[PDB]
Design an enzyme around this catalytic site. Structure first.
Site, PDB file in Angstrom:
ATOM      1  N   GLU A   1       0.813  -1.219   0.000  1.00 34.79           N
ATOM      2  CA  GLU A   1       0.000   0.000   0.000  1.00 34.79           C
ATOM      3  C   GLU A   1       0.850   1.273   0.000  1.00 34.79           C
ATOM      4  O   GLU A   1       0.602   2.217   0.758  1.00 34.79           O
ATOM      5  CB  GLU A   1      -0.972  -0.017   1.182  1.00 34.79           C
ATOM      6  CG  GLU A   1      -1.958  -1.191   1.124  1.00 34.79           C
ATOM      7  CD  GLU A   1      -2.935  -1.247   2.298  1.00 34.79           C
ATOM      8  OE1 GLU A   1      -2.923  -0.349   3.181  1.00 34.79           O
ATOM      9  OE2 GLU A   1      -3.722  -2.212   2.338  1.00 34.79           O
TER      10      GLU A   1
ATOM     11  N   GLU B   1      -6.116 -10.665  -1.707  1.00 38.63           N
ATOM     12  CA  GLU B   1      -6.982 -10.509  -0.531  1.00 38.63           C
ATOM     13  C   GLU B   1      -8.441 -10.458  -0.947  1.00 38.63           C
ATOM     14  O   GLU B   1      -9.220  -9.641  -0.443  1.00 38.63           O
ATOM     15  CB  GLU B   1      -6.614  -9.256   0.284  1.00 38.63           C
ATOM     16  CG  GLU B   1      -5.106  -9.120   0.560  1.00 38.63           C
ATOM     17  CD  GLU B   1      -4.727  -7.933   1.429  1.00 38.63           C
ATOM     18  OE1 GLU B   1      -5.630  -7.247   1.956  1.00 38.63           O
ATOM     19  OE2 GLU B   1      -3.508  -7.686   1.584  1.00 38.63           O
TER      20      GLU B   1
END
Ligand SMILES: [Ca+2]
Ligand SMILES: [Ca+2]
Ligand SMILES: [Ca+2]
Ligand SMILES: [Ca+2]
Ligand code: NI
Ligand code: NI
EC number: 3.2.1.8
Length: 358
Positions: A149, A255
């Site tokens: 991220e 995910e």
């Protein structure tokens, strides 16, 4: 009533020669029905939380290996590949990393010379974290989320403490350090969410392309794929996978979960019995189209990992409660909260191939 997950054909078998099928797990789920489901359906694992920086090294030199080791031992015993979540991340990172040797906060430092000293100290701490973890787990991990991220949703790089103190050098050094101790055989990933959003896709592409041109070892891109029933589009998902394939990179879906709701998840159901059947059907239709896309791009995708097993354990439950005054559930998987198969299970196990033209 629908059959239980341990009574139906294996997901991982259905996607042989296409991609591995993975699940995020906690060590306490490695027994009973959840372990039975893992062995029956999945051939890859990731630690939901036990391998995050704060879990492994919550204080400098205090290593907490037990939960992570249990996941490694399970992957070994049952022949499951193992992804590593995650070496470097702005969330779930212990505060001690960013405190200098006098107890001061590096992000608040104003002296240019002390800033440079802080940058070198922080990078050494990051290097030692990576070295210790990679040396312990090198032969058990086949995909490393080296950084997580690092792209901002609003454009450019995320201005986390890592970026504020080191610029982009923490990303470069993290990959170089992972390669150094993992060896050339280690597969190194940059992981992010909303990789299907064109502006963010492009920022991630530009970052990786620039780093590859400097010789930084990056092998693939992780697409978290925290998606909804109506978003993002298949077209945008396809374009994102192909853009990173064009750089010679592997793609992984890391995910995957499909929320019942939009964003924010306002108006969540507070019991599973209140979820309308038509909504689970819409989820099944969407999962069908999604895995048809994955099949199309199977040469570009090595593994597809769900961020959980069955609906009784998902971070989306906590997210629902956050935006609904403490109550609410979500149901993002193909196995429901009682481990019974959902309409989505049938739609991604099947061999349907008639297309959906309009
Ligand atoms: Ca009710
Ligand atoms: Ca593949
Ligand atoms: Ca749930
Ligand atoms: Ca299907
Ligand atoms: Ni595999
Ligand atoms: Ni279909």
């Amino acid at each position: 009533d629908q059959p239980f997950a341990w009574q139906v054909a294996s997901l991982s078998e259905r996607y042989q020669e296409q991609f591995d099928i993975g699940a995020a797990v906690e060590p306490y789920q490695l027994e009973g029905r959840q372990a039975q489901i893992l062995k029956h359906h999945y051939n890859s694992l990731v630690a939901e939380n036990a391998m995050k920086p704060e879990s492994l090294q919550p204080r400098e030199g205090e290593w907490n290996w037990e939960g992570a080791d249990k996941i490694v031992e399970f992957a070994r015993k049952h022949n499951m590949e193992l992804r590593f979540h995650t070496l470097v991340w702005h969330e779930q990172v212990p505060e001690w990393f960013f405190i200098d040797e006098d107890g001061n906060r590096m992000v608040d430092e104003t002296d240019p010379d002390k800033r440079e000293a802080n940058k070198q100290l922080l990078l050494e701490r990051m290097e030692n974290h990576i070295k210790t973890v990679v040396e312990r787990y090198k032969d058990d991990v086949t995909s490393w989320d080296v950084v997580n991220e690092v792209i901002d949703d609003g454009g450019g790089l995320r201005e986390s403490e890592w970026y504020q103190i080191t610029g982009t050098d923490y990303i470069k050094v993290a990959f170089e350090t992972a390669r150094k101790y993992g060896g050339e055989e280690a597969k190194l990933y940059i992981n992010d969410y909303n990789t299907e959003v064109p502006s963010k896709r492009d920022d991630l592409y530009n970052l990786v392309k620039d780093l590859l041109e400097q010789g930084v070892p990056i092998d693939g891109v992780g697409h978290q794929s925290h998606i909804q029933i109506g978003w993002p589009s298949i077209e945008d998902t396809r374009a994102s996978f192909e853009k990173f394939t064009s750089l010679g990179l592997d793609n992984q879906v890391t995910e995957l979960d499909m929320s019942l709701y939009g964003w924010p998840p306002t108006g969540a159901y507070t019991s599973y019995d209140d979820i309308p059947a038509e909504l689970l059907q819409a989820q099944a239709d969407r999962y069908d189209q999604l895995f048809e896309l994955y099949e199309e791009l199977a040469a570009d995708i090595s593994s597809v990992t769900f961020w959980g097993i069955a609906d009784n354990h998902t971070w989306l439950d906590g997210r629902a409660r956050e935006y609904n005054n403490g109550v609410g559930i979500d149901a993002p998987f193909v196995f429901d909260h009682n481990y019974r198969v959902k309409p989505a299970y049938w739609r991604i196990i099947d061999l349907e191939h008639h297309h959906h033209h309009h």
